[PDB]
């Protein structure tokens, strides 16, 4: 009873204005460390089941270490960037002399500390697993040399349990060339993660946002394998910083709009190409063309500013009056008269053309409405299912009021044959000029004759 939606029959589109923004504007880089134990060399002869298992597990431990040692419409306008450029930058610094030692020094006493590195950047550091103390002090002295007898079997379980976390981490990086996303629990546990969130210099609200949506933060995060110099494993976890919160958001749904004259082809189509998510953020509007990049948790819409264009606030005028002189609304044209449907947040837009059967159904009563060739909309409340031809769409069941804005479909104002129909990222004014050009050429070419 928050989120609402409006359908514009005039432009075959719909806008949902009940959403709140969640923009990633930046990156925070933290350094996670694991103090590791070097081994040389377990030398136990005689194969005892209890001896073989510890050795085998220790062999598993060593191989992990070895593997790590071994590792060392629209949208086309967005441009390119390097997602892990920030994280890689941190990794690079870590490859310096006794920088390891600097950080290895601060984390000896506590498991958490900020160390200023020679780049000058202060970074939160975490020692989450100390296999070293356990392996070097409990395990290693018994194994050397010749006689090794291991009793109390619960010990081999404890070591496999402790070692296990390291093994999944070595496993993941192995299948991701040292960059994983999303960041798994093995890489960084929730307690560790929540602890990480509290020292990040963001708003108490921003911390609040991330903590209720940790599962989202993980998908927008990167874990980057760096170095294993000295006796410490170190990798950098790259977390999103949300500089934009609680600003109004809206999602634009579009569908092909065509004339419904009786002939077979000879039809003209039209489709709005500025579909996607729009959000208010700095007096302008951040527009996200590919709405795959935006995750939704009801009230909150999570987006990454890298795949976006920053547009003027006049962009909203295209939804109410597409012919405004203040903004040239982006569109496409076609002769492709094909039926399809678009499921919106609180309903469904149905582009029905030709002899195609377009229908809406309820789970209980069955078919409840047969569409009359054109762009229409139906609420989510009285409808559960939509079938367009042989393809069946399911409708969203959220709560919220929808508004049908009546208006003559815009495509009907144009005379065929003078209409430009092969336009992919054109616009209103860009269409009008070609018609004008064609209006001039048709009109001037008979005046002379």
């Amino acid at each position: 009873q928050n989120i609402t939606e409006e359908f514009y029959q005039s432009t075959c589109s719909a806008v949902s204005k009940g959403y709140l923004s969640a923009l990633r504007t930046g990156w925070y880089t933290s350094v996670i460390t694991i103090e590791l134990s070097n081994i040389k060399e377990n030398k136990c002869n005689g194969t005892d089941a209890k001896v073989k298992l510890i050795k085998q597990e220790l062999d598993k431990y060593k191989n992990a270490v070895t593997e790590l040692q071994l590792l060392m419409f629209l949208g086309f306008l967005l441009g390119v960037g390097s997602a892990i450029a920030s994280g890689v930058a941190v990794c690079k610094v870590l490859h310096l002399e006794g920088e390891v030692n600097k950080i290895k020094s601060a984390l000896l006493s506590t498991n958490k500390a900020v160390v200023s590195l020679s780049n000058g950047v202060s970074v939160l550091t975490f020692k989450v697993l100390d296999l070293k103390n356990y392996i070097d002090k409990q395990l290693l002295p018994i194994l050397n040399k010749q006689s090794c007898s291991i009793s109390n079997i619960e010990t081999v379980i404890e070591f496999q349990q402790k070692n296990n976390r390291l093994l999944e981490i070595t496993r993941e990086f192995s299948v991701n060339a040292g960059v994983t996303t999303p960041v798994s629990t093995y890489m960084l546990t929730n307690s560790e993660l929540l602890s990480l969130i509290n020292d990040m210099p963001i708003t108490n609200d921003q911390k609040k946002l991330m903590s209720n949506n940790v599962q989202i933060v993980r998908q927008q995060s990167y874990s980057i394998m760096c170095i294993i110099k000295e006796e410490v494993l170190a990798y950098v976890v790259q977390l999103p910083l949300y500089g934009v919160i609680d600003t109004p958001c809206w999602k634009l749904h579009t569908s092909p709009l065509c004339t419904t004259n009786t002939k077979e082809g000879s039809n003209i189509c039209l489709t709005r190409t500025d579909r996607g998510w729009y959000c208010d953020n700095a007096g302008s509007v951040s527009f996200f063309p590919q709405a795959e990049t935006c995750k939704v948790q009801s009230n909150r819409v999570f987006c990454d500013t890298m795949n976006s264009l920053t547009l003027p606030s006049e962009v909203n005028l295209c939804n109410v009056d597409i012919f405004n002189p203040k903004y040239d609304c982006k569109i496409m044209t076609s002769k492709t008269d094909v039926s399809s449907s678009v499921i919106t947040s609180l309903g469904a837009i149905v582009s029905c053309y030709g002899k195609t059967k377009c229908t809406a159904s309820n789970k209980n009563r069955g078919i409840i409405k047969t569409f009359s060739n054109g762009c229409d909309y139906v609420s989510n409340k009285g409808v559960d299912t939509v079938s367009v031809g042989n393809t069946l769409y399911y409708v969203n069941k959220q709560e919220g009021k929808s508004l049908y804005v009546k208006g003559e479909p815009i495509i009907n104002f144009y005379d065929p044959l003078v209409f430009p129909s092969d336009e992919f990222d054109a616009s209103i004014s860009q269409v009008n000029e070609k018609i004008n050009q064609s209006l001039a050429f048709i009109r001037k070419s008979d005046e002379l004759l």
Partner: antibody
Framework: QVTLRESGPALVKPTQTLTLTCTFS??????????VGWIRQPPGKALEWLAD???????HYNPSLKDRLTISKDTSKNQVVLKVTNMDPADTATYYC????????????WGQGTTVTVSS | DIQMTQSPSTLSASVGDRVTITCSAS?????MHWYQQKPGKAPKLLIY???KLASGVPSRFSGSGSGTEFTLTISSLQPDDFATYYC?????????FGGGTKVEIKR
């Protein structure tokens, strides 16, 4: 259910130091995400936030009565302690202790309280 | 530090009359939170996340607002509602409370 309870001398002489012991159950202060905060209410006056502390030992204090505040914890005894130096009868009031979470920055559970009196 | 104002500081209403409480803050904030307090008894949390109902709380209560303006609404003022109501925010330190709203019965 979470339950918290305040303790502390009911009377305290001016300039002396005021120590308060908040004890609780139903939840560990060591568990990730967990916090305890102090809040006071002067007679016939609005509630005033005082201090808090988290499982990661982060501490915060209200600048108005700064630097007179000291907060510490002991997850072993399930209690949090707050100290206030140089008391003034302005501070005569009823204090509450309450839990906080990082998931939700508000005080969901409340001690029934202890009050403190300041006078010679 | 942010500072909260609250109105009306004193209000009274008959059983069943609608009741509206408005909170004003010096800086924009994420969420407004609301507490009920009886005399001498420890304060109780009423509404959280601006409009979300806490447990034990009546659907009679509701929340709404954004930016620096938030409102609490009692759909039908019932005797058990006699209390002082405080607006709160944990959005930025130091935390603040409302100037405080005292309700009774008009007229």
């Amino acid at each position: 259910q979470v339950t918290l309870r305040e303790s502390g001398p009911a009377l305290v002489k001016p300039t002396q130091t005021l120590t308060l012991t908040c004890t609780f159950s139903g939840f560990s202060l060591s568990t990730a995400g967990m916090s305890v905060g102090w809040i006071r209410q002067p007679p016939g006056k609005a509630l005033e936030w005082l201090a808090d502390i988290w499982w990661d030992d982060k501490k915060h204090y209200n600048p108005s009565l700064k630097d007179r505040l000291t907060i510490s914890k002991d997850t072993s005894k399930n209690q949090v302690v707050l100290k206030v130096t140089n008391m003034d009868p302005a501070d005569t009031a009823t204090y509450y202790c309450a839990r906080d979470m990082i998931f939700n920055f508000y005080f969901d559970v409340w001690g029934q309280g202890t009050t403190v009196t300041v006078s010679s | 530090d942010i500072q909260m104002t609250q109105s009306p500081s004193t209000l009274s209403a008959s059983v069943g009359d609608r009741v509206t409480i408005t909170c004003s803050a010096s800086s924009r904030v994420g969420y407004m939170h609301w507490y009920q307090q009886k005399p001498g008894k420890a304060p109780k949390l009423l509404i959280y996340d601006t409009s979300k109902l806490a447990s034990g709380v009546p659907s009679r209560f509701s929340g709404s607002g954004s930016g620096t303006e938030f409102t609490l609404t009692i759909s039908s003022l019932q005797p058990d509602d006699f209390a002082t109501y405080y607006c709160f925010q944990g959005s930025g330190y130091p935390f603040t409370f409302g100037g405080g709203t005292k309700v009774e019965i008009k007229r």
